[PDB]
Write an enzyme that holds these catalytic residues in place. Structure first.
Site, PDB file in Angstrom:
ATOM      1  N   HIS D  80       0.820  -1.196   0.000  1.00  0.00           N
ATOM      2  CA  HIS D  80       0.000   0.000   0.000  1.00  0.00           C
ATOM      3  C   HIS D  80       0.854   1.246   0.000  1.00  0.00           C
ATOM      4  CE1 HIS D  80       0.977  -0.484   4.267  1.00  0.00           C
ATOM      5  NE2 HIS D  80       0.644   0.777   4.432  1.00  0.00           N
ATOM      6  N   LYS D 109       2.603  -0.796  12.849  1.00  0.00           N
ATOM      7  CA  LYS D 109       3.413   0.136  13.615  1.00  0.00           C
ATOM      8  C   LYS D 109       3.709   1.395  12.822  1.00  0.00           C
ATOM      9  CE  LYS D 109       7.638  -0.911  14.233  1.00  0.00           C
ATOM     10  NZ  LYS D 109       8.839  -1.610  14.699  1.00  0.00           N
ATOM     11  N   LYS D 121      10.350  -8.244   6.968  1.00  0.00           N
ATOM     12  CA  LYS D 121      11.185  -8.851   7.982  1.00  0.00           C
ATOM     13  C   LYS D 121      11.925 -10.001   7.339  1.00  0.00           C
ATOM     14  CE  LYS D 121      11.269  -7.956  11.744  1.00  0.00           C
ATOM     15  NZ  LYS D 121      12.166  -7.046  12.459  1.00  0.00           N
ATOM     16  N   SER D 208      20.609   4.414  20.354  1.00  0.00           N
ATOM     17  CA  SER D 208      20.099   4.954  21.602  1.00  0.00           C
ATOM     18  C   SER D 208      18.639   5.359  21.490  1.00  0.00           C
ATOM     19  CB  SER D 208      20.936   6.155  22.015  1.00  0.00           C
ATOM     20  OG  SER D 208      20.710   7.244  21.143  1.00  0.00           O
ATOM     21  N   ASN D 382      18.194  11.610   4.903  1.00  0.00           N
ATOM     22  CA  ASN D 382      19.554  12.132   4.862  1.00  0.00           C
ATOM     23  C   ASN D 382      20.285  11.663   3.617  1.00  0.00           C
ATOM     24  OD1 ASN D 382      22.035  13.175   5.404  1.00  0.00           O
ATOM     25  ND2 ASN D 382      22.440  11.920   7.214  1.00  0.00           N
TER      26      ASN D 382
HETATM   27  N1  LIG Z   1       1.672   5.101  -1.905  1.00  0.00           N
HETATM   28  C1  LIG Z   1       2.681   5.901  -1.559  1.00  0.00           C
HETATM   29  O1  LIG Z   1       3.844   5.538  -1.634  1.00  0.00           O
HETATM   30  C2  LIG Z   1       2.372   7.283  -1.064  1.00  0.00           C
HETATM   31  C3  LIG Z   1       3.244   7.899  -0.174  1.00  0.00           C
HETATM   32  N2  LIG Z   1       3.015   9.130   0.295  1.00  0.00           N
HETATM   33  C4  LIG Z   1       3.968   9.729   1.232  1.00  0.00           C
HETATM   34  O2  LIG Z   1       3.272  10.572   2.154  1.00  0.00           O
HETATM   35  C5  LIG Z   1       3.719  11.929   2.073  1.00  0.00           C
HETATM   36  C6  LIG Z   1       2.546  12.837   1.733  1.00  0.00           C
HETATM   37  O3  LIG Z   1       1.351  12.305   2.302  1.00  0.00           O
HETATM   38  P1  LIG Z   1       1.264  12.001   3.881  1.00  0.00           P
HETATM   39  O4  LIG Z   1       2.432  12.677   4.558  1.00  0.00           O
HETATM   40  O5  LIG Z   1       1.039  10.519   4.063  1.00  0.00           O
HETATM   41  O6  LIG Z   1      -0.083  12.770   4.313  1.00  0.00           O
HETATM   42  P2  LIG Z   1      -0.099  13.723   5.612  1.00  0.00           P
HETATM   43  O7  LIG Z   1       1.112  14.621   5.554  1.00  0.00           O
HETATM   44  O8  LIG Z   1      -1.478  14.326   5.737  1.00  0.00           O
HETATM   45  O9  LIG Z   1       0.105  12.677   6.818  1.00  0.00           O
HETATM   46  C7  LIG Z   1       0.263  11.285   6.551  1.00  0.00           C
HETATM   47  C8  LIG Z   1      -1.084  10.686   6.168  1.00  0.00           C
HETATM   48  O10 LIG Z   1      -0.883   9.495   5.402  1.00  0.00           O
HETATM   49  C9  LIG Z   1      -1.485   8.357   6.025  1.00  0.00           C
HETATM   50  N3  LIG Z   1      -0.441   7.350   6.341  1.00  0.00           N
HETATM   51  C10 LIG Z   1       0.771   7.611   6.864  1.00  0.00           C
HETATM   52  N4  LIG Z   1       1.489   6.471   7.033  1.00  0.00           N
HETATM   53  C11 LIG Z   1       0.724   5.448   6.610  1.00  0.00           C
HETATM   54  C12 LIG Z   1       0.870   3.975   6.511  1.00  0.00           C
HETATM   55  N5  LIG Z   1       2.009   3.355   6.908  1.00  0.00           N
HETATM   56  N6  LIG Z   1      -0.171   3.273   6.012  1.00  0.00           N
HETATM   57  C13 LIG Z   1      -1.306   3.877   5.614  1.00  0.00           C
HETATM   58  N7  LIG Z   1      -1.506   5.205   5.676  1.00  0.00           N
HETATM   59  C14 LIG Z   1      -0.546   6.032   6.156  1.00  0.00           C
HETATM   60  C15 LIG Z   1      -2.151   8.825   7.309  1.00  0.00           C
HETATM   61  O11 LIG Z   1      -3.558   8.572   7.252  1.00  0.00           O
HETATM   62  C16 LIG Z   1      -1.894  10.316   7.400  1.00  0.00           C
HETATM   63  O12 LIG Z   1      -3.134  11.028   7.405  1.00  0.00           O
HETATM   64  C17 LIG Z   1       4.800  12.000   1.006  1.00  0.00           C
HETATM   65  O13 LIG Z   1       6.030  12.448   1.582  1.00  0.00           O
HETATM   66  C18 LIG Z   1       4.960  10.592   0.468  1.00  0.00           C
HETATM   67  O14 LIG Z   1       6.293  10.128   0.702  1.00  0.00           O
HETATM   68  C19 LIG Z   1       1.933   9.822  -0.072  1.00  0.00           C
HETATM   69  C20 LIG Z   1       0.991   9.308  -0.958  1.00  0.00           C
HETATM   70  C21 LIG Z   1       1.120   7.980  -1.543  1.00  0.00           C
HETATM   71  N1  LIG Z   2      29.628   6.789   0.769  1.00  0.00           N
HETATM   72  C1  LIG Z   2      28.762   7.788   0.596  1.00  0.00           C
HETATM   73  O1  LIG Z   2      28.418   8.152  -0.516  1.00  0.00           O
HETATM   74  C2  LIG Z   2      28.203   8.479   1.803  1.00  0.00           C
HETATM   75  C3  LIG Z   2      27.817   9.811   1.710  1.00  0.00           C
HETATM   76  N2  LIG Z   2      27.312  10.472   2.756  1.00  0.00           N
HETATM   77  C4  LIG Z   2      26.924  11.874   2.600  1.00  0.00           C
HETATM   78  O2  LIG Z   2      27.151  12.577   3.824  1.00  0.00           O
HETATM   79  C5  LIG Z   2      25.944  13.131   4.352  1.00  0.00           C
HETATM   80  C6  LIG Z   2      25.694  12.582   5.749  1.00  0.00           C
HETATM   81  O3  LIG Z   2      26.942  12.341   6.395  1.00  0.00           O
HETATM   82  P1  LIG Z   2      28.027  13.522   6.545  1.00  0.00           P
HETATM   83  O4  LIG Z   2      27.344  14.832   6.231  1.00  0.00           O
HETATM   84  O5  LIG Z   2      29.270  13.118   5.789  1.00  0.00           O
HETATM   85  O6  LIG Z   2      28.364  13.493   8.119  1.00  0.00           O
HETATM   86  P2  LIG Z   2      28.385  14.857   8.974  1.00  0.00           P
HETATM   87  O7  LIG Z   2      27.140  15.644   8.642  1.00  0.00           O
HETATM   88  O8  LIG Z   2      28.693  14.508  10.411  1.00  0.00           O
HETATM   89  O9  LIG Z   2      29.653  15.636   8.362  1.00  0.00           O
HETATM   90  C7  LIG Z   2      30.413  15.063   7.301  1.00  0.00           C
HETATM   91  C8  LIG Z   2      31.282  13.938   7.849  1.00  0.00           C
HETATM   92  O10 LIG Z   2      31.618  13.030   6.796  1.00  0.00           O
HETATM   93  C9  LIG Z   2      33.033  12.923   6.621  1.00  0.00           C
HETATM   94  N3  LIG Z   2      33.401  13.361   5.252  1.00  0.00           N
HETATM   95  C10 LIG Z   2      32.908  14.437   4.610  1.00  0.00           C
HETATM   96  N4  LIG Z   2      33.450  14.562   3.373  1.00  0.00           N
HETATM   97  C11 LIG Z   2      34.315  13.544   3.206  1.00  0.00           C
HETATM   98  C12 LIG Z   2      35.224  13.080   2.131  1.00  0.00           C
HETATM   99  N5  LIG Z   2      35.318  13.747   0.956  1.00  0.00           N
HETATM  100  N6  LIG Z   2      35.956  11.969   2.365  1.00  0.00           N
HETATM  101  C13 LIG Z   2      35.872  11.296   3.528  1.00  0.00           C
HETATM  102  N7  LIG Z   2      35.070  11.660   4.544  1.00  0.00           N
HETATM  103  C14 LIG Z   2      34.279  12.756   4.448  1.00  0.00           C
HETATM  104  C15 LIG Z   2      33.699  13.826   7.646  1.00  0.00           C
HETATM  105  O11 LIG Z   2      34.525  13.050   8.520  1.00  0.00           O
HETATM  106  C16 LIG Z   2      32.579  14.476   8.432  1.00  0.00           C
HETATM  107  O12 LIG Z   2      32.680  14.123   9.814  1.00  0.00           O
HETATM  108  C17 LIG Z   2      24.811  12.764   3.404  1.00  0.00           C
HETATM  109  O13 LIG Z   2      24.206  13.950   2.880  1.00  0.00           O
HETATM  110  C18 LIG Z   2      25.439  11.962   2.282  1.00  0.00           C
HETATM  111  O14 LIG Z   2      25.244  12.631   1.034  1.00  0.00           O
HETATM  112  C19 LIG Z   2      27.156   9.876   3.943  1.00  0.00           C
HETATM  113  C20 LIG Z   2      27.505   8.545   4.155  1.00  0.00           C
HETATM  114  C21 LIG Z   2      28.067   7.713   3.099  1.00  0.00           C
END
Ligand SMILES: NC(=O)C1=CN([C@@H]2O[C@H](COP(=O)(O)OP(=O)(O)OC[C@H]3O[C@@H](n4cnc5c(N)ncnc54)[C@H](O)[C@@H]3O)[C@@H](O)[C@H]2O)C=CC1
Ligand SMILES: NC(=O)C1=CN([C@@H]2O[C@H](COP(=O)(O)OP(=O)(O)OC[C@H]3O[C@@H](n4cnc5c(N)ncnc54)[C@H](O)[C@@H]3O)[C@@H](O)[C@H]2O)C=CC1
Ligand SMILES: NC(=O)C1=CN([C@@H]2O[C@H](COP(=O)(O)OP(=O)(O)OC[C@H]3O[C@@H](n4cnc5c(N)ncnc54)[C@H](O)[C@@H]3O)[C@@H](O)[C@H]2O)C=CC1
Ligand SMILES: NC(=O)C1=CN([C@@H]2O[C@H](COP(=O)(O)OP(=O)(O)OC[C@H]3O[C@@H](n4cnc5c(N)ncnc54)[C@H](O)[C@@H]3O)[C@@H](O)[C@H]2O)C=CC1
Ligand SMILES: NC(=O)C1=CN([C@@H]2O[C@H](COP(=O)(O)OP(=O)(O)OC[C@H]3O[C@@H](n4cnc5c(N)ncnc54)[C@H](O)[C@@H]3O)[C@@H](O)[C@H]2O)C=CC1
Ligand SMILES: NC(=O)C1=CN([C@@H]2O[C@H](COP(=O)(O)OP(=O)(O)OC[C@H]3O[C@@H](n4cnc5c(N)ncnc54)[C@H](O)[C@@H]3O)[C@@H](O)[C@H]2O)C=CC1
Lengths: 496, 496, 125, 496
Positions: D80, D109, D121, D208, D382
């Site tokens: 769904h 959940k 799972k 945690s 992220n």
């Molecule tokens: N089929 C899909 O993959 C869809 C995913 N979405 C996701 O939802 C966001 C926008 O809509 P929402 O945030 O959901 O609306 P919203 O921002 O109003 O709050 C979530 C709503 O979606 C429903 N909902 C949330 N989790 C659910 C689950 N596990 N099973 C059934 N219903 C659930 C709840 O009834 C709630 O009212 C988007 O970021 C998108 O990622 C939205 C529409 C369709």
């Molecule tokens: N292998 C990959 O492609 C990965 C990419 N990321 C990227 O990093 C973001 C989340 O984690 P971060 O922001 O990095 O952690 P963060 O928000 O704590 O700050 C960046 C950290 O990543 C490390 N880092 C940054 N640039 C680097 C490089 N060029 N080489 C080696 N290490 C580097 C640094 O040690 C720093 O502590 C995401 O937006 C994602 O785009 C994160 C994890 C894995």
């Protein structure tokens, strides 16, 4: 009357005849003055036509076991900026030329309001009223396949939306079909379509917003005597009467969203007859008979009106039914001061001529029906970011503002203190509603009103730069063409 | 004269009106007799139209730096059997309706000669003569992209071939473009197109074979007095004079491949004038001026002929120039006994009426222009099997036949021996040419002549089953429709 | 990346016929893409060359990729660029200098006083 | 005791038996009252079962050169809403029925706490203790392939996470395997899995946070005498003693994160024996022996406790070890007032019966173990946004708030000025920590506490709407079912 496609095309030239001159000056190069003119004209010969058109036919089996065929269309105008968008229109008056036309508009409209999309439009020779809900769903789910099967549906290539004679259902049937054949491995499958139900990835104000875009457009010109001094009218919706041509989602939601601010409706006209009541009409009451009767003829608190709505004395005329509704055979009998095209080119090039002579303000489809687009731009994002807007910060932004006010309170006390004792710094009424941050309902309502104002500002700004007076329509195309042009030019017209 | 698309469509009905009856009897089910009739008629309403049509426009930059736009088309008629095929026609008289028509034919033609393909046809509003070789190659390589970019080119979906005003070059420019953008990972990239040069995956007799298909068609009716007794003619090409309408690849190679067996040409007509010489004309000599002059007017060994070829007294009239060449305004002046449509529907439904009244044998495009298809079916295989035909066995099959003859020789000697001494068993002349097995040049020459005979046999067999007499055209469609039909029926008309 | 070439000797119709061919071969072998590899400008290039790479990837492979214009940076504004695209490098330099000149901890060694109003500089190219 | 899968299923009905009535009323249509009931019941017969289950077997070579086989499972409950999630459990008591069950929970959940995921799972019949780190890594990297090789791993289809007997390592071995075979061209390859190390795309509080979700759940009911007045207990963690059943990541981090606010632990029980000390136990000290000894038996500051933790007098009982831990054979001997299921269905339908009779508050797995999910929802984002949260605005938001306070200061001075001289408006202590904007550590901590409160509010709100009293468990399913249902219904149950 005329080739709806050429009509739009006749306009486009009017705008290009004008911007050409300045457009050459902007162009920087070492070419000869004439050669530059042959650069721009050549490009303008590329923009005007549509790049892809698909005509296809379907075998479908009915409920009675008998097959019939269906003719469907899908045009893409411009690839200067993807995705391409447009709606699916179910109707028997569908034709390749209507589709190509409407596609072109969506391309220019989206450039007026600065949304990064191109133009498309679909169609199906069909009358839904004659078919069940088990036949309309067996059509739609087959239409979707053939297109996806040929690269005209996709989050990143082309994105359909609702239009005449469709709704949220049809969008719920397109999504499950793409997501269950091709989209399975695509993380962005639900972005293949907009206008979806809320439970399938939709947006608050999905449909009401179009009506509001209309409003926020009117409200953005009525607020300026700079133009109503010409019309001989005074600002204020509490002082205005209006009529509506048809009850789509535009006709209703534009009507009631006006009624909230003192705008009086006096009649309305459906495909089966008009109805008039100078004392006013209640749109809430109007939805009532529509659920119990289907039509408006028979509504007790209004008199069946003999004649076309277009012949009604009023202050603002809202054509919302279908294009070509107002022609030169009746334009002289406008009987109204402003016209607001909520209907994808109801008027004509001649009518425009009449309405300049008569000093009639005509609000173009462009900039006026661009509400349903921005919203669909916010629904395409919602589904690419996979998260409700602001969810992550509602609690953080809430108290961050509460720790701010305490830093005022405590620093003030710190100096005066005993002078007045304690100084409670607390929210107002409305800020208490807006202290936790933006909810989708709020982003939408605001983003829409913002864009619309920003754009009209650019529109009226060039209409005065060139002294077009009331000819807003041409004032719009100039901006559009001026934007689109920069893209093809800077892009190296082709990659060949 | 009339809607070329409806013309073809008017025919198709004639055939279906007839087979309907028997077609219902073949259909086995428990439905009512009338319901079965509503099954077949419904299907026939699905076959007749084309399923996909694409209209697109190109920005291209010329040599002089100026851009222009180009209009291109591509139709697919039937998906009952993939791939779909058809040629690319460069011409200014291209139109959506011509494309849809020709697509339909390729679908029925391929079913006459039992090749597993559907129908397609492309087009480009262009006149090559006005453009260079650096502009025609910059068009073609851009045309190819846009289609592949939308799923209309591919070894397994759609396969283009040559047609009017094209050749092997254009096919060499399509291959390198698909293979160098998408086909890179596809093991079957060179099967995306036929008509290629030999060094790029072509076939011997690529083009000569069309002319031969014509021949082997004529030869397969001239050999039967069953029909020439009506015409009042005697079998034998050494006894026949013929004329040609235009010099395509059909007009030349059909002409010379006749000249080999005593068929005398008396005139020929190009787009710029005819030329006649009752004493005969030498096609070898004709290629000479074409390399030195371009046109036939000015050829020394023939007299410039004033008037249309269609007005020439002859025994066989070969229209090869373009469709619609022979109409009702001139059909009564046939002046010829057999007509052989090597030109994709030169005649009309009326002309057909005239030519039945006049007892004129008309050989249909179907079964007559189906040479260039079978060959392109052998070039699509060659490039899917990635090997020259027979290469693996030339040496094995050669001596296996030599060890066979020794088993005759040695067993015979074994009994008689001294009676006559040694008995050399050796090949003849021609078997010595055919002892090593089949070479591509031999598979082609044979497979073609085989199919053609097999098919005419099926054609004449039904024309007598229904007593159509000379109306071969209808005799063909019945077979086609009868085949295509079985596919949709047994297939479960749809998967929805 | 790199190309043995001197642009000055070639036209704008030859440099664009190189670039659009360079791009293909790489993409054709998995070295260009929003998620694998992303080119940018350097010596003797600019925004043009980036406008010619984008249209080439987006028009052969990127067509179905929703992120095709992320295949390259340094693009013109109308093609997905950023304000300060190029000025910013110079500013990064500045904000680097400004982040050491503001500390006598090191300029006390150099024997210099903080302040750009007090400095003269030269440029190599 | 009973079929763990049917247990969960027996619950689900209890909830559906109830919501059915209201659920029909919400449903709007023209069907008969009974037909609507047959719409909802039919859907509920679709939700309850799992849609995809995969059972596979592996050949792997050990260190000693000998091969053995491994049995692995992977279930997907509901499509769904994609992606689908769930953890990988290494254990010898893995079975198809346990997997299907747990999958179902993750689906419900995730709907309680409104995260857009479905349920999955996995499982592996294995005991890690018997294998090296070079054998566990040769299993994992092979398990990952086979699934991806069959479409059960992917950023947009299915996303695994940690569970019993796994950790961050195993997630570091799955990422490199997907990203290095298939993910290479996918821009979102590191979103294929959560629970990763920080250097590979993880989140602060990854583990945690589960313990904290527990806490913030308890804290959200202890704060209301509305229910503790029944229990006969007073709010306040400084007044409570609790015990723990096993030391997972839940048992430890739930334990210490309580200890911070005056909640006293009195014993704890591992798989090898309990240990009790009424004067308290120090979780910091507890990690010490776990690094030096492995088990808790032998800890000097606590007495080895003879008997099951479940038989310990306390105020709150935290089962965290494994499901089925508390049955009807011992439920009457609860000896405790609240139970908080941090262990995926430790209790039973009977125990529930006992604990309603005894007036025992039972906190369900649902809404209580939903901490580790939201976080994994923030780690999936992220890695789709490719940026640290807030990085772009830390400096802008910092001074924007500093220019705000100066606009207060300077406007106030402007009026009073000399009255009090200068009026320094400066942050407080904590706002000075929060003036630069939100850091990931802050988004996480907050977003979690927000969701949990929002949800319990919805839970307790329906428990009173239907007067379920202490039966919170049923109060949860009703919300879940009520949400999930709307999706299938509005969606057009199928696309066939
Ligand atoms: N089929 C899909 O993959 C869809 C995913 N979405 C996701 O939802 C966001 C926008 O809509 P929402 O945030 O959901 O609306 P919203 O921002 O109003 O709050 C979530 C709503 O979606 C429903 N909902 C949330 N989790 C659910 C689950 N596990 N099973 C059934 N219903 C659930 C709840 O009834 C709630 O009212 C988007 O970021 C998108 O990622 C939205 C529409 C369709
Ligand atoms: N292998 C990959 O492609 C990965 C990419 N990321 C990227 O990093 C973001 C989340 O984690 P971060 O922001 O990095 O952690 P963060 O928000 O704590 O700050 C960046 C950290 O990543 C490390 N880092 C940054 N640039 C680097 C490089 N060029 N080489 C080696 N290490 C580097 C640094 O040690 C720093 O502590 C995401 O937006 C994602 O785009 C994160 C994890 C894995
Ligand atoms: N509905 C939408 O989302 C959008 C609508 N529009 C424009 O707004 C107009 C109306 O809104 P839609 O919802 O699209 O249409 P709709 O699907 O609401 O139908 C229009 C209504 O007007 C009545 N009508 C039809 N033909 C008429 C005629 N010749 N004279 C008087 N009444 C007639 C019909 O009873 C119908 O119920 C359309 O023409 C369309 O071009 C434009 C953009 C979006
Ligand atoms: N570009 C490609 O991949 C093409 C491959 N072929 C392959 O060739 C077969 C049909 O044509 P052929 O058998 O080649 O013609 P063929 O059967 O007449 O004999 C091979 C011919 O191809 C040329 N040729 C063979 N190997 C070559 C090489 N390594 N480099 C350059 N030229 C070479 C030779 O000149 C020779 O005349 C098909 O089975 C197909 O697999 C054919 C055309 C294009
Ligand atoms: N060439 C091929 O591979 C195939 C050709 N055909 C049919 O054969 C016909 C001729 O062969 P193509 O090679 O296709 O054409 P083509 O490309 O050889 O050109 C036909 C020639 O006839 C002359 N011509 C054009 N219009 C004429 C007119 N109205 N009257 C007299 N002469 C005229 C032109 O000078 C031109 O050179 C075509 O009409 C086509 O329908 C059918 C299947 C394959
Ligand atoms: N760890 C996690 O990320 C999550 C855990 N859970 C639930 O929390 C519970 C424990 O946390 P996990 O880290 O998953 O487990 P874990 O991997 O920390 O192991 C549980 C510990 O409890 C002990 N134990 C095992 N069986 C026992 C028994 N019959 N009696 C007493 N002690 C026993 C073992 O020594 C083991 O160290 C699990 O049962 C699981 O259902 C739920 C969601 C996420």
């Amino acid at each position: 009357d005329p080739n709806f496609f050429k009509m739009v095309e006749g306009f486009f030239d009017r705008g290009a005849s004008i911007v050409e001159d300045k457009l050459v000056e902007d162009l920087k190069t070492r070419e000869t003055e004439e050669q530059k003119r042959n650069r721009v004209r050549s490009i303008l010969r590329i923009i005007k036509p549509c790049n892809h058109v698909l005509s296809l036919s379907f075998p479908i089996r009915r409920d009675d076991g008998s097959w019939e065929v269906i003719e469907g269309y899908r045009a893409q105008h411009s690839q200067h900026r993807t995705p391409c968008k447009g709606g699916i229109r179910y109707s028997t008056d569908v034709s390749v030329d209507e589709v190509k036309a409407l596609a072109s508009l969506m391309t220019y409209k989206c450039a007026v309001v600065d949304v990064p999309f191109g133009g498309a439009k679909a169609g199906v020779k069909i009358n839904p009223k004659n078919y069940t809900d088990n036949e309309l769903e067996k059509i739609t789910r087959r239409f979707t396949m053939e297109l996806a099967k040929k690269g005209f549906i996709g989050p990143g290539v082309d994105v359909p939306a609702p239009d005449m004679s469709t709704g949220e259902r049809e969008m719920s049937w397109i999504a499950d079909t793409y997501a269950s054949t091709i989209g399975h491995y695509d993380i962005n499958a639900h972005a293949c379509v907009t206008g979806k139900p809320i439970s399938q990835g939709g947006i608050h104000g999905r449909i009401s917003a179009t009506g509001r875009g209309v409003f926020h457009g009117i409200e953005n010109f009525i607020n300026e005597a700079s133009y109503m001094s010409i019309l001989g009218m005074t600002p204020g919706f509490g002082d205005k009467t209006f009529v509506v041509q048809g009850f789509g989602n535009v006709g209703l939601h534009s009507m009631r969203y006006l009624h909230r601010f003192g705008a009086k409706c006096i009649t309305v006209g459906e495909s089966d007859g008009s109805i008039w009541n100078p004392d006013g009409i209640d749109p809430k009451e109007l939805e009532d008979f529509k659920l119990q009767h289907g039509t408006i003829l028979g509504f007790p608190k209004a008199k069946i009106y003999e004649g076309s709505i277009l012949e009604v004395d009023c202050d603002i005329l809202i054509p919302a039914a279908s294009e070509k509704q107002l022609t030169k055979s009746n334009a002289p009998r406008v009987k109204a001061k402003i016209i607001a095209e909520g209907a994808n080119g109801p008027t004509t090039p001649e009518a425009d001529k009449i309405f300049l002579e008569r000093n009639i303000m005509v609000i173009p489809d462009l900039y006026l029906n661009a509400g349903g687009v921005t919203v669909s731009y916010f629904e395409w994002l919602n589904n690419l970011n996979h998260v409700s807007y602001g969810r992550l910060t509602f609690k953080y932004e809430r108290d961050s503002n509460y720790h701010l006010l305490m830093s005022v309170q405590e620093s003030l006390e710190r100096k005066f203190g005993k002078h007045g004792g304690t100084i409670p710094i607390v929210p107002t009424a409305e800020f208490q509603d807006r202290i936790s941050g933006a909810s989708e309902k709020d982003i939408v309502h605001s983003g829409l009103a913002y864009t619309m104002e920003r754009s009209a500002r650019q529109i009226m700004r060039t209409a005065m730069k060139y002294n077009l007076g009331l000819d807003l329509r041409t004032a719009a195309y100039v901006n559009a063409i001026e934007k689109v042009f920069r893209v093809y030019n800077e892009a190296g017209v082709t990659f060949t």
